[PDB]
Amino acid sequence: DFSITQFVRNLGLEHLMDIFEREQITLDVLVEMGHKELKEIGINAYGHRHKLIKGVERLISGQQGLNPYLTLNTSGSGTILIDLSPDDKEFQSVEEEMQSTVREHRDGGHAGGIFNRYNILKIQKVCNKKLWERYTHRRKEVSEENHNHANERMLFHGSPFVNAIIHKGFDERHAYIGGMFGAGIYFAENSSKSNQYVYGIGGGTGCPVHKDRSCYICHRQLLFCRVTLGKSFLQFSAMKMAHSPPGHHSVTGRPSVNGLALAEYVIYRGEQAYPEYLITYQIM
Amino acid sequence: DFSITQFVRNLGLEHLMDIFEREQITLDVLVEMGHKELKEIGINAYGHRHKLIKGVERLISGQQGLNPYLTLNTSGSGTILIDLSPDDKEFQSVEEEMQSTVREHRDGGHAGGIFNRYNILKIQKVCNKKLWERYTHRRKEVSEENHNHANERMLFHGSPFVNAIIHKGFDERHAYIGGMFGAGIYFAENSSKSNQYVYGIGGGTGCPVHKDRSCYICHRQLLFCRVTLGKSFLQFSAMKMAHSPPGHHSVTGRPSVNGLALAEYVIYRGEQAYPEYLITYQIM
Ligand SMILES: COc1cc(-c2ccccc2)ncc1C(=O)Nc1ccc2c(=O)nc(-c3ccc(C(C)(C)O)cc3)[nH]c2c1
Ligand SMILES: COc1cc(-c2ccccc2)ncc1C(=O)Nc1ccc2c(=O)nc(-c3ccc(C(C)(C)O)cc3)[nH]c2c1
Ligand SMILES: [Zn+2]
Ligand SMILES: [Zn+2]
C-alpha cells in the first residue's frame, strides 16, 4: 500500500490515509475514482477531492510516455474457463459438431487411434480480454481488406501445448514448421484429423501414462476455435510457404478426394485465431 | 402539419406556435427534444418546457399501445445507394471476386451467354436500417443456436426483381418454387452461375430490348449479399423441401462434380440474407 501512501503524501493529504486504509483503496483503484466515488468513501471537502483528481490526472496523462496506467492495470487480466452445462444447447451443438465430423483416415488409426465416437467429459469457454481484443482488431483489419467480410469459421485444433495457447493465444512463432503447406498454424473441419495431433505430430508417442496412441482411459483435449480466413488461397498440392500468398489471408486445401473428408486451413499469423472452446474427451 | 398545432393548443401554449413555425418544429421533431434543445430554440420559461415534455411523455408512453411513435418516425426510412469509387480497394475486392469466379457451364452459355469476364460499370452499397436490423436480429438468433457461430458468407444472387429486393429485402414468400432443393432463396459462389438468372429462370427471353440472352450491350445487375448459413445441411441429390431440415438453418449442394464448380446454397427464411452490394455490369 506504499504507492498510494507516497502519492497522498506528495499532495499533503496524509491525514486522509486512515480512510484509504479502511476502504482498501490502492493506487490502481484511486486512479479510477471521480468526485462521486470519493464522496462515497467520505472525502467530503471539495478541495481534497480536487487535489486528488488533479494528481491522478498529472500522473496518468502528464507522464503518459511512461505508461503508469498499464503498470497499474495488470490485475484481473488472464484467462478464465467457464464450464458449459451439458443440458444447454451450446454444449449440445459443440458436441454434435465434434461427433458428426469423425471419419476414417488414410492410416488405420495409427496416429489418433481407432474409434467411431467420443465420450465428452466437459466443454469450457475460454475468456481472455487481451487476446480477444487482439483477435477482434485483426478481424476488423482483415474485413476492411475483403469487402467488409471476415470469412470467419469455427475449426478444430489439436496440440500438446493447449494450455500455452489458452493462456497466451495462438502464435505463429510456434508454427508447424514441417507442415505440408509450410510454417503456419493448421486447423481442420474434421475433429478426428485434429485429434491425430493431440499428443504431437503423427500422434507422438501416445498418452504420457501409457505411451499408447489409442488409449481409451487417458483424457484428451481439443480446441474449437474462431478462425479468420479472409481471402483464402485454394491450394491443391504441397507447397512450403512462410507467409500467405500476396493478397490473401489464409490457405485452404483438401488432401483427399471428394467424400466424407472435409477441408483444412492454414493461417500464417497468430492473431487470426482465437481458442473459444476447450473440449475434454476420451475416444471410445 | 396540424398535429403540432393541436398538441400545443391542447396544452394552452399556442402563444409559442410562432417560434415553432420559424424553427420548422413538427411533432416528430418535438417528441425528440428535451430541456436543452427547447432552451436552444427559445423556450426560456421552465414551466413551458415542463409542460411540453410531459405532454410528449403522455403521448409516447401513455398511449404506447397505439404506437404513435411509429406513426411519427416513418420519415427517413428507405434505401440509399452509396457508390464505391473504382480507386477504392473495396471496389477492387468486389470486382476481383466477380471476375475470378467465372467458369464454363453445362450448357454452352445458353442461359447466361458466352463470355470470359465482365465489364463492371459501378458498384453500390445498399443501406436500409430496418432491413439491416431484421437481418442482424436473425443472425443473433442463429448464432445462439449454433455455438456462437453464424456461419456467415458472401454469395452472389441473380434475379429480375433486384429493385424489389433492395427496397423490401429478401422474402421467402417470393421463393424459387421450382428449384431443385425446393421453395427457397438460392445463392451461388460462382458469379457466372447467378448471372444465368438475371433475366429469369433459364435466362428467360434475354434482355428486355433485344430479347437476347447473350446480349453484350444491355446492363445487367447482380447482388453480392451477406448470407447467414448457421448449421447447414449438405445435400447430394435433388430433394424438394419447403423449409430447412430439422436442426439446420440452410442447405448446401452443387450439381457438378467438376472441381471448377463452387458450392451453391439455399435458405428458406428471407431474413437470413441482406443485399450488401449491387453490381452493374456487362458480359463481354
Ligand atoms: C492444410 O492441411 C493439410 C493439407 C495437406 C494437403 C497436402 C496435399 C494436397 C492438399 C492438402 N496435407 C496435410 C495437411 C495437414 O497437416 N492438416 C492439419 C490439420 C490439423 C492439424 C492440427 O490440429 N494440428 C497440427 C499441429 C499442431 C501443433 C504442432 C506443433 C508444432 C506444436 O507440434 C504441429 C502440428 N497440425 C494440423 C495439420
Ligand atoms: C442449390 O442450388 C442448386 C443445386 C442443384 C443440385 C442438383 C443436384 C444435386 C446437387 C445440387 N442444382 C441447381 C441449383 C440452383 O439452381 N442454384 C442456383 C444458384 C443461383 C441462383 C440465383 O442467383 N437466382 C435464382 C433465382 C432467383 C429468383 C427467381 C425468381 C424470382 C424468378 O423466382 C428464380 C431463380 N436461382 C438460383 C439457383
Ligand atoms: Zn493411457
Ligand atoms: Zn440487349
From Swiss-Prot, chains A, B:
Q: What does the PTM comment state?
A: Ubiquitinated at 'Lys-48' and 'Lys-63' by RNF146 when auto-poly-ADP-ribosylated; this leads to degradation. Deubiquitinated by USP25; leading to stabilization. ADP-ribosylated (-auto). Poly-ADP-ribosylated protein is recognized by RNF146, followed by ubiquitination.
- Annotated ranges, domain SAM: 1-62
Tissue-specific expression? Highly expressed in placenta, skeletal muscle, liver, brain, kidney, heart, thymus, spinal cord, lung, peripheral blood leukocytes, pancreas, lymph nodes, spleen, prostate, testis, ovary, small intestine, colon, mammary gland, breast and breast carcinoma, and in common-type meningioma. Highly expressed in fetal liver, heart and brain.
The segment(s) forming the PARP catalytic domain are: 85-284
Sequence positions that bind Zn(2+): 207, 210, 215, 218
Cellular localisation: Cytoplasm; Golgi apparatus membrane; Nucleus; Chromosome, Telomere
What is the annotated role of this protein in its UniProt record? Poly-ADP-ribosyltransferase involved in various processes such as Wnt signaling pathway, telomere length and vesicle trafficking. Acts as an activator of the Wnt signaling pathway by mediating poly-ADP-ribosylation of AXIN1 and AXIN2, 2 key components of the beta-catenin destruction complex: poly-ADP-ribosylated target proteins are recognized by RNF146, which mediates their ubiquitination and subsequent degradation. Also mediates poly-ADP-ribosylation of BLZF1 and CASC3, followed by recruitment of RNF146 and subsequent ubiquitination.
Q: How is the subunit organization of this protein annotated in UniProt?
A: Oligomerizes and associates with TNKS. Interacts with the cytoplasmic domain of LNPEP/Otase in SLC2A4/GLUT4-vesicles. Binds to the N-terminus of Grb14 and TRF1 with its ankyrin repeat region. Interacts with HIF1AN. Interacts with RNF146; this interaction leads to ubiquitination and proteasomal degradation. Interacts with NUMA1.
Which family does the record assign? Belongs to the ARTD/PARP family.
Name of this protein: Poly [ADP-ribose] polymerase tankyrase-2
Which organism was this protein described from? Answer: Homo sapiens (Human)
The uppermost taxa in this organism's lineage are: Eukaryota, Metazoa, Chordata, Craniata, Vertebrata
State which gene encodes it: TNKS2
